[PDB]
Amino acid sequence: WSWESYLEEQKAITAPVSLFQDSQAVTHNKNGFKLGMKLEGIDPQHPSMYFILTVAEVCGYRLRLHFDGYSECHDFWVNANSPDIHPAGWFEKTGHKLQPPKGYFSWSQYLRSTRAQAAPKHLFVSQSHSPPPLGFQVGMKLEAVDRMNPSLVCVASVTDVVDSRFLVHFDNWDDTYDYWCDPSSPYIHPVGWCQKQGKPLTPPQDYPDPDNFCWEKYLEETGASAVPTWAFKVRPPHSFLVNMKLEAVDRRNPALIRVASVEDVEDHRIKIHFDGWSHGYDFWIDADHPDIHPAGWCSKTGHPLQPPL
């Protein structure tokens, strides 16, 4: 099987590499991560939590990470150029909390009990050594769209700042709805944007008297400031067109990567259809999501590609 034969027998074309983010299109970097190496990283199920993780499998420009002390079912795949992992000893130099390995923390003491080797700092694109997001200070409040319930634009707080990205938290909720983004993010808005727009604003979960919610009183009673309206930047809609073909990680199994087509489009989203497969599997994904790549990515990085059904 080949792209050239398949694009030839199907009369289609691939999304131009220029439609992609550099992080998604980059194929010439070596995955320097080795088996058994220990790093720190965010639980994807809770983007505000930091765990001790161990490389359990490498495949091309991707690695499978294990949750030290917990089950192997919680394992997940990231790219080598992932910004959601950090070098051992990072959580402490930067003021983040680590969740110890089940049953437990000191790294030097851990790397001696485990006889492991920590992944060399130089592998990591993110060590909070870079310029922060402008206008987004921790504790500042904003209005954010719940990506899990898009119609819900809720009262949110900036809870984390790593390098170029901040973490949007939904007040009074846990962090399952929390998400990492940058100023340009299409899903974030400045205080008073909902009222300015006519849309309702979802008060914090169980905010006493959801009927008298007041950004002025709330900001004042929480001791918080609002991210300045000048901080929010515009993200140009992608140039992805329908029928274009790419490679996209399979959701029902993160380990695989498939031949896929742009089913439908928005300004900032993309419908991925897996070729030869049913359409009931099609999914909306963010055009900037790290799990979509140009045709030739899998081949150029040494990751197996799933041909159409």
Tell me if 127 sits within 8 A of 148, measured CB to CB.
no
- Region of residue 194 (phi > 0: left; psi between -120 and 50: alpha; otherwise: beta): alpha
Nearest to 3 by CA among 289, 257, 271: 257
Long-range CB contacts (within 8 A, 24+) of 50-58: 50/86, 50/91, 50/96, 50/97, 50/98, 50/99, 51/98, 51/99, 52/88, 52/98, 52/99, 52/100, 52/101, 52/105, 52/110, 53/85, 54/116, 55/119, 58/31, 58/33, 58/34
Ramachandran region of residue 36, left (φ > 0), alpha (ψ -120 to 50) or beta?
left
Identity of residue 165:
R
Structure tokens at 164: 């170029």
Angle, alpha carbons 54-55-61 (nearest 5°): 150
From 280, 304, 296, select the one nearest 16 (Cα to Cα).
Answer: 296
Q: Which residues contact 260 (CB under 8 A, 6 or more apart)?
A: 245, 246, 247, 248, 272, 273, 274, 275, 292
Residues 135, 140, 145, 149, Cα dihedral to 10°: 150
Query: Facing residues of 245 across strands?
Result: 14, 261
Nearest residue to 162 (alpha-carbon basis) of 48, 38, 289: 48
- The long-range contacts involving 274-278, CB below 8 angstroms and separated by at least 24 positions, are 274/248, 274/250, 274/308, 274/309, 275/245, 275/308, 275/309, 276/307, 276/308, 276/309, 277/308, 277/309
Q: Which two tokens stand for residue 60?
A: 């091309």
Q: How far is CA 29 from CA 73, 93, 187, 197, in A?
A: 29, 27, 31, 45
Domains plus CATH for the chain? 1-29+238-309 (2.30.30.140), 30-128 (2.30.30.140), 129-237 (2.30.30.140)
Contact of 36 with 20, CB cutoff 8 Å: no
Cα–Cα dist 28/30, whole Å: 7
Resolution (in Å) of the shown entry?
2.5
Looking only at the bridges linking them, the beta strands covering 283-286 and 269-274 are antiparallel
- Residue 82 CB neighbours (<10 A): 23
Instruction: Report the Cα 30 to chain-centroid distance in Å.
Output: 21
112: left (phi over 0), alpha (psi -120 to 50) or beta: alpha
